[PDB]
């Protein structure tokens, strides 16, 4: 049995955490934990549980040393093999910080200076000060070819385009967790240019993209362009070598609504930070109400790229972020606008569009973001509003109970990873992390430790306790992706990838092993702001809750 076969959280364990490793295959009967320094025997485990998934004949053996609670460095010996690990406070803090700092590396329109960036420094790229109104985006005062400035914001992912749906959703998710852990985020410092101001660094980072988002709203009708893009994806070149023309394209109802929701949300969160962000809270709220108004007038204005390409030139072939179901965006936006303005007219829209069931958050399914807003503590809800919130809590708990059913008997001892349908493009964020986030919220709503225990299990999975043995976050753990599908990492002249990115993961042989660490793997090794938003959400909340 190779050392390789011992699958565990490669960052380590909190002192009071469940502590489980899984041997991926082979006959095992016993394991031992040793103090790495003193050489003292600390724990011996026997009578070990084993299990198999439906699709793999490998015998997975569970090693449970949860009773070891003293901080320190330890050695796990199983048969021939061994691995060292740490038990320590704040074990996920470097992960939470790196996940947030990834957004800094994605920033456009500014130099990425070594002081903050380390070896992954670069010159400014994509100023986006000379951007064309695409014919699909034309308005009376802005005919096709009009030049606008639409600067700042993040690169979306492995490509260099900027998308309102995905970035609005991403901020919406991170700012949901922010609101639960104000002290945590106030104290967090991640060495970005804004680390010495008076504003929590998470909010500084969000604002870098929020400021860009404001420029994507037509100052007349209030509508919001779906994305800022080149016509084609660029090759794997540095930002300074990119030469395609940049366009803003067709206004969409989902762009308008995700803009409205996140701007209404942001209005509240930045109210205290007029010093560093003067006027933003007020501007965001005004902008939000205008965007929501536009969406009301154009409720079925979906972004269909194929149809756009039949009517307009140049053809656009970058990320679609298409959706013909806007009820959830209406729900999230109306909910945020209700909480920011108090107006009953927005409440009624939220109630009309309420979800019947809880589903985890995703870029095109924003029901959960609305639900999180309704479930927020400290907000003094009236009888009807409390009754509504209570009904949403019930649905969250129904979802959570179903997710955790049988989790302790799974091969990898987590709710995520024992169903073939768990594996697909971006699954580690979309399902594993966001299932974790959902479980963390269920803990917050009930105080039932079992939900939180299961959230940590899903985190252990992405950090190495899985079928491949990868810690699926660049720059962290023992065996992590060195070749992400990421134009920034691939085109710099630095061997190690930019750190802190969650790769998409296995995406179909065994479905949970359908992963390749190569730069051409869009299918399994892509990185993205919405995937990192999930990682920031789960890692930050699990670290904050550990104390
Ligand atoms: Ca700051
Ligand atoms: Ca939707
Ligand atoms: Cl691109
Ligand atoms: Cl779901
Ligand atoms: Mg590189």
From Swiss-Prot:
Protein topology in the membrane = Lipid-anchor
- Cell membrane as a keyword? no
UniProt keyword Hydrolase present: yes
Q: Could you say what a knockout of this gene produces?
A: No visible phenotype. No effect on growth.
- UniProt GO cellular component terms: cell outer membrane
Kindly list the GO molecular function terms attached to this UniProt entry.
Answer: cellulase activity; xyloglucan-specific endo-beta-1,4-glucanase activity
Active site feature = 159 (nucleophile), 485, 517, 526 (proton donor)
Q: How does activity depend on pH?
A: Optimum pH is 6.0-7.0.
* Major subcellular location class: membrane
Q: Where in the cell is it found?
A: Cell outer membrane
BP GO annotations: symbiotic process benefiting host; xyloglucan catabolic process
Under the heading InterPro entries, the entry gives: 6-hairpin_glycosidase_sf, 6hp_glycosidase-like_sf, Cellulase_Ig-like, Glyco_hydro_9, Glyco_hydro_9_Asp/Glu_AS, Glyco_hydro_9_His_AS, Ig-like_fold, Ig_E-set
According to the UniProt entry, what is the EC number of this protein? Answer: 3.2.1.151
Its job: Catalyzes endohydrolysis of 1,4-beta-D-glucosidic linkages in xyloglucan with retention of the beta-configuration of the glycosyl residues in xyloglucan degradation. Cleaves the backbone of the 3 major types of natural xyloglucans (seed galactoxyloglucan from tamarind kernel, dicot fucogalactoxyloglucan from lettuce leaves, and solanaceous arabinogalactoxyloglucan from tomato fruit), to produce xyloglucan oligosaccharides. May be superfluous in xyloglucan degradation compared to BoGH5A (AC A7LXT7), the other Xyloglucan-specific endo-beta-1,4-glucanase.
Query: What family does the Swiss-Prot or TrEMBL record give for this protein?
Result: Belongs to the glycosyl hydrolase 9 (cellulase E) family.
Q: What is this protein called?
A: Xyloglucan-specific endo-beta-1,4-glucanase BoGH9A
The organism's lineage is: Bacteria, Pseudomonadati, Bacteroidota, Bacteroidia, Bacteroidales
